[PDB]
Amino acid sequence: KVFGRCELAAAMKRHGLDNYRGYSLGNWVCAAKFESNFNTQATNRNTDGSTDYGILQINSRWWCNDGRTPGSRNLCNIPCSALLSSDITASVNCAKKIVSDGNGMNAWVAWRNRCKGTDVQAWIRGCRL
Numbered sequence: 001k002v003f004g005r006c007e008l009a010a011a012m013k014r015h016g017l018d019n020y021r022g023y024s025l026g027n028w029v030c031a032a033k034f035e036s037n038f039n040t041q042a043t044n045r046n047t048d049g050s051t052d053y054g055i056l057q058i059n060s061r062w063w064c065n066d067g068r069t070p071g072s073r074n075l076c077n078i079p080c081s082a083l084l085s086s087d088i089t090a091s092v093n094c095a096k097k098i099v100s101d102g103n104g105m106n107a108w109v110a111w112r113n114r115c116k117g118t119d120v121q122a123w124i125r126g127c128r129l
């Protein structure tokens with residue numbers, strides 16, 4: 001599924017991401033835009049052999065099992081294919097673990113390079129929340 005901007009903001013709010021670990025809702029919408037262009041089916045292969053999956057591009061070396069990343073962990077205890085669903089529950093639950101790991105939202109390279117330090121409230125302007 002390809003989400004609309006305000007559609008995704010509402011779903012993320014219903015799943016408890018607004019102000020989770022102190023990150024306002026616009027941060028999460030900004031990260032999704034630049035990681036996946038709001039597309040739940042997005043995949044990207046990395047140089048080290050792992051693959052990133054889903055709307056928040058969660059990586060197979062640490063967080064999910066895809067059967068082809070040797071010597072990796074599965075810290076969210078899910079198959080990576082669960083992260084491509086139109087329902088974002090699995091992506092939201094795993095993202096909550098990642099942002100609690102110590103480095104906050106800096107774990108998402110696109111957030112650090114394109115969202116951090118900007119006016120992220122603009123990503124939820126005009127939405128009925």
Ligand SMILES: [Cl-]
Binds near residue numbers: 021105
């Ligand atoms: Cl933080």
Ligand code: NA
Binds near residue numbers: 034035
């Ligand atoms: Na990316």
Ligand code: NA
Binds near residue numbers: 072074
């Ligand atoms: Na893995």
